[PDB]
């Protein structure tokens, strides 16, 4: 988030950073009972064992190096959907509108 | 040709119209009014032509 | 009354302004924090009637 002329521009610096954000919103922000994606660091072997419904969902992985440790993730998707996130210069955050020059 | 100048006060002069839409309207007693609506990206030069 | 109405009606369809000259917007340029003023010129639409 950057600030100038009283307005605060935000953006997500990476598609993976936007994925983890979408996970938290779908979980806590808006209470939707079927969540379309679930991201967990648990090995998919045991994660499938505890959650039997993840055995039918498409999965792709992506890793991150936090504090020197290679933390890997497993994104499970059950439905082909698309989402949008601000990537450059969007001062009007909270309205779902793409301003001119964004 | 007639000149028009809008001076800002303390109430509004504390805001900068960046990435916003401005609209001004001049409506005389008899005759059609003139509306001017522009979009400002970023002020530059200390006299921005927009 | 009707004659005076047509006279006003003709002045309505004939009187109008126009913007001839770009608009200027002033601000503290090094640090965009406070706006100062705005200036622009206006003229009758055509050489049709005063306003």
3-state helix vs strand vs coil in chain B, percent to 5? 0, 45, 55
Q: Does A3 touch chain B (CB under 8 A)?
A: no
Choose among A17, C37, C41: nearest CA to B34. C41
Say whether A7 and B15 touch across the interface (CB within 8 A): no
Choose among C28, C46, C45: nearest CA to C37. C28
**Exposure pattern of B33-44 as b/e (b: 16+ CB <10 Å)?**
ebeeeeebeebe
- Backbone phi, psi, residue A29, to 5°: -70, -60
Q: Report the sign of the C-alpha dihedral through residues B48, C45, B1, C50, in that order.
A: negative
With contact defined as beta carbons under 8 Å apart, do C33 and A5 qualify? yes
- Output the six-digit token pair for C33: 């924090």
Residues 6 or more apart in contact with residue C28 via CB below 8 angstroms = B46, C34, C36
With contact defined as beta carbons under 8 Å apart, do A88 and A11 qualify? yes
**Which residue's structure tokens are 């660091």?**
A41
Query: How far apart are the CA of B16 and the nearest CA of chain C, in angstroms?
Result: 6
- CB-count exposure of residue B31 (10 Å: 0-12, 13-18, 19+): buried
With contact defined as beta carbons under 8 Å apart, do A13 and A86 qualify? no
Query: How many CB atoms are closer than 10 A to CB A60?
Result: 10
Report d(CA A57, CA A79) in Å as an integer: 8
Say whether B4 and C39 touch across the interface (CB within 8 A): yes
- The bridge status of strand B34-40 relative to strand B47-49 is unpaired
The experimental technique behind this entry is cryo-EM
Closest chain A residue to B17, measured at CA = A5
Q: How many residues belong to chain A?
A: 102
Report d(CA A39, CA A30) in Å as an integer: 17
Which conformational region is residue A65 in: left (phi greater than 0), alpha (psi within -120 to 50 degrees), or beta?
Answer: beta
- CB-count exposure of residue C35 (10 Å: 0-12, 13-18, 19+): buried
Report d(CA A34, CA A79) in Å as an integer: 11
Run of H or E residues at A59: strand A58-66
With contact defined as beta carbons under 8 Å apart, do A76 and A38 qualify? yes
Residue A11 is classified by DSSP as -
Report d(CA B31, CA B10) in Å as an integer: 33
């Amino acid at each position: 988030q950057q600030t100038n002329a009283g307005q605060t521009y935000v953006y997500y610096p990476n598609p993976y950073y936007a994925l983890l954000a979408l996970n938290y919103t779908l979980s806590k922000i808006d209470k939707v009972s079927p969540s379309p994606l679930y991201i967990t660091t648990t090995t998919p072997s045991s994660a499938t064992q505890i959650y039997p419904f993840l055995a039918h969902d498409n999965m792709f992985t992506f890793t991150l190096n936090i504090s020197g440790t290679l933390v890997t993730y497993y994104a499970f998707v059950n439905q082909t959907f698309a989402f949008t996130y601000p990537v450059a210069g969007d001062p009007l955050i909270g309205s779902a509108i793409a301003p001119a020059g964004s | 040709v007639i000149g028009v100048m809008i001076l800002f006060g303390p109430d509004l002069g504390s805001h900068v119209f960046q990435y916003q839409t401005i609209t001004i309207q001049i409506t005389p007693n008899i005759g059609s009014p003139l509306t001017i609506s522009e979009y400002v990206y970023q002020p530059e030069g200390s006299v921005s032509v927009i | 009354k009707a004659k005076s109405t047509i006279n006003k009606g003709e002045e309505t369809a004939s009187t109008a302004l126009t913007l001839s000259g770009s608009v200027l917007y002033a601000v503290n340029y090094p640090s965009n924090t406070r706006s100062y003023w705005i200036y622009f010129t206006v003229s009758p639409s055509s050489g049709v009637s005063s306003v």
